[PDB]
């Protein structure tokens, strides 16, 4: 009963930071690589970040590398996305993802509901 | 009949010749086995024995095919010399105690004894060789070692002497599977050809039965071989156990990932064994005469 619940999104100004959480449930998260995708309206879902089962490696899309870090806590079954130096083009719904193989020809994707991150472009 | 010293020397030389000839197959198998472990940002993906060999040669040089070759030669000189030169002494100890023809069980037991002792003796060589074969400058993982003896010194002084025996139990398991499967499959196919008259008892029956047995042994030991390679290659802390590594391979990559590098593995097993057998018999007779 895989369940991914993303939280921590919101509306922040350009240059702001935001920490997204992903509570993973219904599976042994310690054996699975975890992914963060994002999708904005009018665009295809975009892979953002990936982290190993215990956090041994982390990989990022070139558009987010250095600004976004992916972190893990398997004792809490939580995956974190710290997003610094946010740009208005980072506005998207961010999705936590598990790709499960097991006894499968292809990996099967489990997604959360997504958490909306809007980066504001206002000048004060 | 060759002396046990002649047998050990001949097995060592034959194993070294086979290993130096077939080493690029070993490098290709290792590069295929660790391929999906960490995602790569490079466009260099390995596929097939020829594709992997050419990709390695053209992205990182001819010599990178023979990376860890001195470790492989040390593995021959110690491990394979023991495993091949002591086989007849062990087999005589077992079967000739009662003046018995060598049964399948006798062969299995002799091979298990020699292979287990050889695996334990030569595990440091396997660790260093696998870690040198798997290391690259292209896939975002930093190489740890500059060569065979540098790897020996670094592992010994940073991971302990026990860190040089990492992956011993998966290697023992692979050795058991290879031995049992090859011998049982060889006898089963020899009978199958003889009773369904498919081949009669010239050499081709023995040769085709050896080919099938070798492929079956490689296929049966492939999951353990992949897990062994990835566990041995892994730095301390990445995998809390060998079953942990296997479970992560299963959940993140599926069942077919347990047969990565199967074709290079089977090619190396077959070619290595043929070359080693020819050179070993030739060396034993050629020395033992003079
Ligand atoms: C005869 C045995 C081969 C020569 C002896 C080993 C040479 C050597 O130093 O290899 C180390 C290096 C690298 O080892 P290293 O990574 O441990 O340093 O391996 C080679 O590049 C040797 C290439 C040998 C090519 C043989 C082709 C088949 C004939
Ligand atoms: N008991 C056995 N029976 C037949 N062949 C074997 C046995 N043990 C090992 N081999 C094969 O002999 C070849 C050389 O042996 P070596 O000691 O280099 O094994 P390895 O390096 O641990 O395995 P690999 O060569 O697949 O990395 C290998 O291809 C291996 O598959």
Residue A108, chain B, CB below 8 Å: the answer is no
Phi, psi of A19 (to 5 degrees): -105, 115
The continuous run of DSSP H or E covering B156 comes out as: helix B148-158
**Segments forming the whole domain that contains residue B275:** 4-288
Q: Which residues line the pocket of ligand 2, CB cutoff 6 A?
A: B 19, 26, 75, 79-80, 111, 115, 126, 175, 178-179, 182, 265, 268-269, 272-273
By the 10 Å C-beta count (0-12 exposed, 13-18 middle, 19+ buried), A41 is classed as exposed
Classified as helix, coil or strand, B127 is: helix
The count of C-alpha atoms lying within 13 angstroms of the C-alpha of B288, restricted to the half-sphere facing its C-beta, is: 16
**Cα-based angle B156, B141, A52 (whole degrees, multiple of 5):** 100
By the 10 Å C-beta count (0-12 exposed, 13-18 middle, 19+ buried), B206 is classed as middle
Which tokens in the block code for residue A94?
């961010």
Smallest Cα–Cα separation from B177: which of B95, B278, B58, B258? B258
**Segments forming the whole domain that contains residue A90:** 3-120
- Residue carrying the six token digits 């975002």: B140
Alpha-carbon gap: A75 to the closest alpha carbon of chain B (Å): 15
**Residue having the nearest C-alpha atom to atom 23 of ligand 2:** B26
Contact A85, A13 (CB under 8 A): no
CA distances from B270 to B123, B152, B267 (A): 22, 29, 5
Written in H, E and C, the secondary structure of chain A is CCEEEEECCCEEECCCCEEEEEEEECCCHHHCCEEEEEECCCCCCEEEEEECCCCCCEEECCCCECCEEEEEECCCCEEEEEECCCCHHHCEEEEEEEEECCCCCCCEEEECCCEEEEEECCCC
CB count in 10 Å sphere of residue A53 = 23
Which tokens in the block code for residue B266?
């089977």
**B245/B40 Cα distance (integer angstroms):** 19
Which tokens in the block code for residue B73?
């030669």
Smallest Cα–Cα separation from B54: which of B76, B31, B20? B31
Residue A59, chain B, CB below 8 Å: the answer is yes
**B288/B145 Cα distance (integer angstroms):** 41
Which tokens in the block code for residue B77?
């000189």
Q: DSSP secondary structure string, B12-31?
A: HHHHHHHHHHHHHHHHHHHH
Classified as helix, coil or strand, B257 is: helix
CA distances from A86 to A39, A51, A95, A97, B90 (A): 15, 21, 17, 21, 70
**A68/B11 Cα distance (integer angstroms):** 56
Q: How many domains are there within chain B?
A: 1
**Residue having the nearest C-alpha atom to atom 20 of ligand 2:** B126
By the 10 Å C-beta count (0-12 exposed, 13-18 middle, 19+ buried), A66 is classed as exposed
In chain B, residues preceding a discontinuity (C to N beyond 2.5 A) are none
- Determination technique used: cryo-EM
Classified as helix, coil or strand, B97 is: coil
Smallest Cα–Cα separation from B224: which of B266, B169, B166? B169
CA-based max dimension of chain A:
55
User: Residue B287's Cα: distance from chain center in Å?
Assistant: 27
With b for 16 or more beta-carbon neighbours within 10 A and e for fewer, the B45-76 pattern comes to ebeebeebbebbeeeeeeebbbbbbbbbbbbb
**B22/B84 Cα distance (integer angstroms):** 18
With CA atoms as reference, the chain A residue closest to B239 would be: A54
Long-range contacts (CB closer than 8 Å, 24 or more residues apart) made by B103-110: B104/B183, B104/B184, B104/B187, B107/B183, B108/B179, B108/B180, B108/B183, B108/B184
- Binding-site residue numbers of B for fatty acid 16:0 are 47, 260
Classified as helix, coil or strand, B109 is: helix
Domain CATH for A100: 2.60.40.10
Q: How many domains are there within chain A?
A: 1
Residues in contact with A107: Cβ distance below 8 Å, sequence separation at least 6, in sequence order: A99, A100, A101, B254
**B186/B55 Cα distance (integer angstroms):** 35
Q: DSSP secondary structure string, B29-81?
A: HHHHHTTTTS--SSS----SHHHHHHHHHHHH-STTTTTTHHHHHHHIIIIIH
**Cα-based angle B66, B218, B116 (whole degrees, multiple of 5):** 80
CB contact under 8 A, B252 and A50: no
Which tokens in the block code for residue B101?
């023809």
Please report the resolution in angstroms. 2.6
Spell out which chain B residues touch chain A, with contact meaning CB-CB distance below 8 angstroms: 38-39, 41, 237-238, 247-248, 250-255, 257
CA torsion sign for A119, A121, A122, A124 is: positive
Residues in A closer than 8 angstroms to B248, CB to CB, are 31, 53
Task: State in Å: Cα B269 to ligand 2 middle.
Answer: 6
**Residue having the nearest C-alpha atom to atom 21 of ligand 1:** B63
Mode of pairing for the β-strands spanning A68-73 and A11-13: unpaired
Classified as helix, coil or strand, B284 is: helix
């Amino acid at each position: 009963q895989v369940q991914l619940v993303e939280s921590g999104g919101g509306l922040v100004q350009a240059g702001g930071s935001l920490r997204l959480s992903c509570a993973a449930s219904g599976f042994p998260v310690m054996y699975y690589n975890m992914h963060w995708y994002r999708q904005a309206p009018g665009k295809e879902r975009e892979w953002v970040a990936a982290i190993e089962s215990t956090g041994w490696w982390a990989h990022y899309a070139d558009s987010v590398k250095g600004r976004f870090t992916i972190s893990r806590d398997n004792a809490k079954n939580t995956v974190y996305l710290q997003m610094n130096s946010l740009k208005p083009e980072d506005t998207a719904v961010y999705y936590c993802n598990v790709k499960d193989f097991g006894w499968r020809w292809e990996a099967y994707d489990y997604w959360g509901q997504g958490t909306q991150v809007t980066v504001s472009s206002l000048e004060h | 009949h060759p002396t046990l010293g002649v047998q050990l020397f001949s097995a060592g030389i034959a194993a070294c010749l086979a290993d130096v000839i077939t080493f690029p197959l070993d490098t290709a198998k290792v590069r295929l086995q660790v391929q999906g472990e960490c995602p790569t940002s490079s466009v260099i993906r390995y596929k097939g024995v020829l594709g992997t060999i050419t990709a390695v040669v053209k992205t990182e040089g001819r010599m990178k095919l023979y990376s860890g070759l001195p470790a492989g030669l040390q593995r021959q000189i110690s491990s394979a010399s023991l495993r091949i030169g002591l086989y007849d002494t062990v087999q005589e100890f077992l079967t000739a105690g009662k003046e018995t023809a060598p049964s399948l069980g006798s062969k299995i037991l002799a091979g298990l004894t020699t292979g287990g002792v050889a695996v334990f003796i030569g595990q440091p060589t396997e660790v260093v060789k696998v870690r040198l074969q798997a290391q690259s400058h292209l896939h975002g993982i930093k190489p740890r070692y500059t060569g065979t003896y540098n790897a020996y010194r670094i592992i010994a002084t940073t991971e302990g002497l026990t860190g040089l025996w990492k992956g011993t139990t998966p290697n023992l398991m692979r050795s058991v599977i290879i031995n049992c499967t090859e011998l049982v499959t060889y006898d089963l196919m020899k009978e199958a050809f003889v009773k369904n008259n498919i081949l009669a008892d010239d050499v081709p029956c023995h040769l085709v039965s050896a080919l099938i047995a070798g492929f079956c042994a490689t296929a049966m030991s492939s999951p353990v071989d992949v897990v062994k390679t990835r566990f041995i290659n892994s730095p301390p802390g990445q995998y809390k156990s060998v079953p942990n590594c296997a479970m992560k391979v299963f959940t993140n990559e599926g069942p077919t990932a347990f047969f990565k590098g199967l074709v290079p593995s089977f090619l190396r097993l077959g070619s290595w064994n043929v070359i080693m057998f020819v050179c070993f018999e030739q060396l034993k007779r050629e020395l033992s005469k003079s």
